Amino acid sequence: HFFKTFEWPSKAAGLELQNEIEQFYYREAQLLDHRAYEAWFALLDKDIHYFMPLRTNRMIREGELEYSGDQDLAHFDETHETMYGRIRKVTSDVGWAENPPSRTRHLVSNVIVKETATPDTFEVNSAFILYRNRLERQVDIFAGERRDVLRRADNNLGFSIAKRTILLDASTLLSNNLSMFF
Amino acid sequence: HFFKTFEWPSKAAGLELQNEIEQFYYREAQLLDHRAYEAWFALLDKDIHYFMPLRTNRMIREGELEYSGDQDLAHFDETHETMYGRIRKVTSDVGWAENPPSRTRHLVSNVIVKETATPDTFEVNSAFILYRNRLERQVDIFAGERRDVLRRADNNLGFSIAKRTILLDASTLLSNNLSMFF
Amino acid sequence: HFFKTFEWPSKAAGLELQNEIEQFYYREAQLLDHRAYEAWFALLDKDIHYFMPLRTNRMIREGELEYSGDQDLAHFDETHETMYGRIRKVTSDVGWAENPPSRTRHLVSNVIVKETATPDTFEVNSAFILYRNRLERQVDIFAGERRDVLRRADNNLGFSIAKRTILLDASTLLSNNLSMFF
Amino acid sequence: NWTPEAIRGLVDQEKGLLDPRIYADQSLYELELERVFGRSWLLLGHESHVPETGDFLATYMGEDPVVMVRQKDKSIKVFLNQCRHRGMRICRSDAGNAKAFTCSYHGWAYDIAGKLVNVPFEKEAFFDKAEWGPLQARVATYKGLVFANWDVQAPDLETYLGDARPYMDVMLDRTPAGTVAIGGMQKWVIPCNWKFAAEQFCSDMYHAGTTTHLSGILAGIPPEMDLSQAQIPTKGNQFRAAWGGHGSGWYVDEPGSLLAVMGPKVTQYWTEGPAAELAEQRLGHTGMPVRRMVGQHMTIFPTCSFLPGINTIRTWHPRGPNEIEVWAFTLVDADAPAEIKEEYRRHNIRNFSAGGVFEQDDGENWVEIQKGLRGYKAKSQPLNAQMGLGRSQTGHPDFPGNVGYVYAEEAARGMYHHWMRMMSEPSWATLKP
Amino acid sequence: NWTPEAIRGLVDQEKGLLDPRIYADQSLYELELERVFGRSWLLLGHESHVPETGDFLATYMGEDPVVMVRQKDKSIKVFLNQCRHRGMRICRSDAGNAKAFTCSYHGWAYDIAGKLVNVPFEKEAFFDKAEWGPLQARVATYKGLVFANWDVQAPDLETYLGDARPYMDVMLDRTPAGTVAIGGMQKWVIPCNWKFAAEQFCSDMYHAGTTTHLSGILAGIPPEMDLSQAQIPTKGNQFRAAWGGHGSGWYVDEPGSLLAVMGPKVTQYWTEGPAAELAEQRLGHTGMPVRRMVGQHMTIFPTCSFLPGINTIRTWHPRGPNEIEVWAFTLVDADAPAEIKEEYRRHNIRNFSAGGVFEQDDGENWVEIQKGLRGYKAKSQPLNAQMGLGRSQTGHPDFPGNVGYVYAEEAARGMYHHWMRMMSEPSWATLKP
Amino acid sequence: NWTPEAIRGLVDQEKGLLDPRIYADQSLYELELERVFGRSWLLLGHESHVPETGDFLATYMGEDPVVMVRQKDKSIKVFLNQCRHRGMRICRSDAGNAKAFTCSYHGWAYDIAGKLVNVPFEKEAFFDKAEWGPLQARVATYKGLVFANWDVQAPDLETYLGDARPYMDVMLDRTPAGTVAIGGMQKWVIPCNWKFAAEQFCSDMYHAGTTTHLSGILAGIPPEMDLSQAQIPTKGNQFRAAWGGHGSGWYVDEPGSLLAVMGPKVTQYWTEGPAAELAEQRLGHTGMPVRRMVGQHMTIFPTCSFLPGINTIRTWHPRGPNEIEVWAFTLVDADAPAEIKEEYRRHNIRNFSAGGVFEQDDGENWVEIQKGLRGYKAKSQPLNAQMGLGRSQTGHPDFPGNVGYVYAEEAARGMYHHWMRMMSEPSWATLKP
């Protein structure tokens, strides 16, 4: 439950690998940003662990306690089924928080690709700004990083997601909801 | 006319083309962020169409009516001529809205390149945050996506702009103006 | 002393080099965003000039005065020795501004690389959004650009920082401090 | 409060002085929401915004959200977008077609008239349904424009407008087919007071005849020209409504000032040919040389502002004394040729838009004044409203009503006087024309 | 200012009317701080938040920040997080462990008792350190939860809770081992007044009975078994407190919307087997049929809210009339099996967090209501609180207290009733039960 | 709302109590604007910011925007950045050089002296131009520092300064060439009341010689050593003005604490050498041992602050009670050599900038205090300002005026008392020395 600097590989991923992942994230963002929730959902693997701990203000001495843990509450801590119900809710004619829907942009940069022991599975670090605009005048700006495990897959995106941890740059949430996906 | 997920090609752009297009935008952003409005304008072809539709809160039932169409008002719907009017205004000493000028940053990412029927012409998708600081303490943050038609050009940057549609993540604009170019 | 559009070279950096410099900044952003201050400081060379000028509202006619000059005050005008003192502070348990510390995001893009006269030493331009959330509810958002001189290095990231000029998109600072590094 | 006597100290139409505090003062703004916005006829849009049974537009009267919906009987009703149970927004979209409106909180259904028709679990917890529907507004149409008012006591729309109506007609009455709104309603936030916006469109051509629009004009002329070939227009007039603080202003015989804004085709359609002639005939009863009038600006008090030949039209929704939202659209004659409607669309977007080459400068002044008014000394001295003082005459050969020069503040004073009256006089008994 | 007489008229439980102004007046908010928040019993979390000595937790009481720290003698002190020298925050992190609290501004140090025990440069400068410590606040406990209070005159915690305790226990007193708080305090900002948050947990099951959670429900049933066959709960009752405006409500005989809201393993624990019956006998000393009693909601005026069955519990910290912070957390039976403690964590994340399939729709209504209340008109007429008016019994077989139907506003009327009393009666003499 | 009885009881100079509400009260602030900034002498900058004809600086007197502009006759006029027509900002950049000032709204033109010289369309619509120029402020210089006052009835500068003058002299009068300002004016927004920042520079070394700047000291000392090897200074004194509310505080006989801040080379300049001798040889009529005075902190009431050793100097522009803007700059002696100027520059940026190793911690205190003053209980009981009570006296061999010990809240008392004396007494005849 303590994160620290991402352990980038010493030799960078080849130019092909870096591009493929990058393009995967840009495709991902287009799906989300255009509310194609179902096609987004289809990216998640059976074993998915979608996680986003709480952060707290800690004195330096108590820095190893910055993030919430596995036996604590999170903003998200999901599996395929819990993700499906969330998907189910957000697409509902009668789910008010997203009818009318929001307007978001997922801006992806800082993509670091690390190869795992398993070929075709990769550990990926990236940074994001998520911009959510809503109702008449509501703007919520989110920032953080994503820690993904991604497998090559034969969907039109070229990858699927096995694990996503989201380090949101927030203690208390400045927004009234998290109706969006990271 | 409703928008939907950018139809990326399944065969991704080669690495060299991916890079040329991204560099193009990085230089475009440098030009605008340094107020080289005349140099920027030189990029626009005589048959350019520059269009930023309005966006509305629509119930899922009616989500096809999200953006204004081709015979509706828009934040920009411009030809080479009217664009030139806007450059004339923003470069004028007696253009009060932008004298003194703002300070802008066009952060660009999520670049997806697609081919067209025409050789050396490309349809390009990308995301942006445009940050505008102004006066003493005015800050305006915009996000959205752009859908361009770029043509390889014998000019300073590599490409010319045939078409640009900007999908702005906003319904009501929070900014008192759109004095900046996307 | 004014800045002007980055003078990008006619012939763009090779794809390989483009990527090494990008990765470098992504790695640098991880160190800072995870408070590895000693690791970050170690990127800074003997002769570092770490400079962030004041920015003013000028009438277009006096646009050559927009930035503070070499013998004026600045937000940052640093040597290895003064940077050290600053790192001394940021990491100290009696440094109140950053104990408890902030949560930052260094989002990097628009990276333009240019050879110098010396081989293995590069002049590099890039855009940033730096998101600093701290305490309960404070958010500060910085956009700007960086003009670096980078030397190839036998260190963990691949490069050392010989010069950094930060042009911040601000006149009056909206944040109460600049505790963070750029 | 804010004694009735102290409010009258604020405006002096006689000496032509204004008290800066009217733009900044919060207690005054709260007064306004009741004594101005609560009682006034406010523009919601255009009939063509809601053409079919069920079609609606979510908008605002003051800071109260309202729904404007077309009925079975082709009438328009306007009701608070507030469920009366606990307050939830009943219409949550900007616009569309509704077969009915359901509150999303506890499920109190309503029909397209805003009648409460179904409370779920009514027998098991309850109360007359027909007395807990949302507050309805008065609704009045003038040649396509939809206005609304809360006060049952207030003067009706026709009377409220008075001798402003011939001037509205220049825009609204040119053809038997009437006006249609172009689709799209553009919205943006300006950090200033509504009275700035409203005054400008009421009586200020001065800003156009001088410094504000230099760069806009430049943008309107051919590339080979600059402001050296640009004649400052000096012929025209200004009208102060007999009652109500409404006003207008226009150039006479100066077609080049329209040309730089709307381009050759619209300039022609407005001034020459069958359509323009038809417009002069239809408005023969007013006795105005409609064809020679360009640059027209108008405000129907408090916050209905439009520019007749250009056909941009907006409502300034107040949002505090330091802020408004601009809700702007554009009208075209419904039988104007396609090419003309398209030129109207294109030139409104170029000029009168958050990004418009004129609008950008219109708002910049307002914004910068509003920051100045944050200070003590800034508020401690009267502003000058003495332009064309006592020079305005009631029997002009060409234009009816109280009429002076184009560069004048008579209609400005007119606006501020009525504003004061409406703020100081709690009974329509004294207030009505 | 706001006369005792005026305040009384803002609420009327007789006819059942609420002045919408209550959720929005700034003056009434600021008086709410002095008369409600500076004199009430405000939840701070659980004992299990500060197990060891020195263990603290920065939190709030109204808009005053407080340190709740564990003591040497295993007691719990609570004091204003403000050094009485010049104002500084003493404890500057969210949670942790302390042997000392130093004030970074000028050195003044403190111990976990919260007593001033050193002032740098005491003699050359200066006074008695014992009378210049951080304003102390009364502390008490109920079956786990900590509460605090600034006013010496106020009725002790046990008295204040009154006859609400039987219902609280349904969550808390299910074992002699007790409840424990799963670590981590969820926090988010909501632009909406506190009383809707308070009221929704008090009387409002109506929202769940109707429309709000149609999406929440839809989420927890297979793709084969789709919501075209919806079964809405009917049977259940609501509690109004004898004093102090608390309240609760629940369904009876209906494991319907608890199997879909919380999964099987948690139903088959709250309802069936050893651990279920143990609870019924621990608190069946009120005739309570707690095993058939699902989906309960409850509030302890002003701001302690929780859903006993579900186990999420939160404090709404007021942030003006237009804003609150939800500081939530979940509770488990300390002796409960781990698998069920995981099921309680996972589900309080899926359902009652910022992105929660239930909470989202919960907050939306309040969000959208608060926006409406900006308008003059939307604040000029009474809101309908008339559900089950005078239909609740003075005594019941299966449940104690003043008890009505589940869909009713009796608790709510109580809540706003007590709210009014505290705002109007400055002398504790009158207000105490 | 606030009678001059209650204003009296906010600050108590005799007991050493201050009412927390003086930092947070919106109404007190509005009165602050009028009674304090409205008529105090205010720091705008230094003469060298506007050295040639028409050089201007756009700055602030309170929340009132002002332009400070050199005239052909070598003097400096200051005037309100507000056109009296409709309130537009007249000067629109931070600094530079005007040969004139024009209003962008309607073209009212002005000479560099603020005199209205041209109104477009004057003979067509109008009135004396001489009576409609922007409001002037009175302007006084003190060895380079430019001050401005609106009130023609307030005392002149030297009398406003009085006996606070010689403690200013330590920075300003060192040589017969006088100070110059290093280019650049740094600016940031601190969310904290102005009085705190003013107080801290008046009578708060206490923070320096305790906990605040431990980090900052650590940042100045060689890489080879830690905090422990050393000792924080104790020998020094504090001044309080006979009239004004001003206060300086300094150390005596401990040069090491300046070495830690400004570096070997500048500390050399301040304490040894020909120029540091020419200093007292000019400061004789003060009888001050200036070579032994290090780390001076000063405030000229209400918002002019500096540190005579370091030469950072700033106005705190008020932006509400919950906010300030710091406008900071840096002074050097004009004939001081190039290397000494540069070391000042570097060390100012290093320590006193928005990211300076010292300034960061100064502001962070204030930020978190104000956050506290949101709540009611945090505003109920008073704040301790008892330090050094009655220990200061009229006679002191080396230090003029009412002097005490360095670690005292005595200068603080006279500031807050003179604040109280400016918020109550409305006529200057009673206030004037």
Ligand code: FES
């Ligand atoms: S408020 Fe609309 S149904 Fe309850």
Ligand code: FES
């Ligand atoms: S305020 Fe805590 S020591 Fe000065």
Ligand code: FES
């Ligand atoms: S506002 Fe200055 S000329 Fe009208």
Ligand SMILES: [Fe+2]
């Ligand atoms: Fe205009």
Ligand SMILES: [Fe+2]
């Ligand atoms: Fe609910």
Ligand SMILES: [Fe+2]
């Ligand atoms: Fe300090």
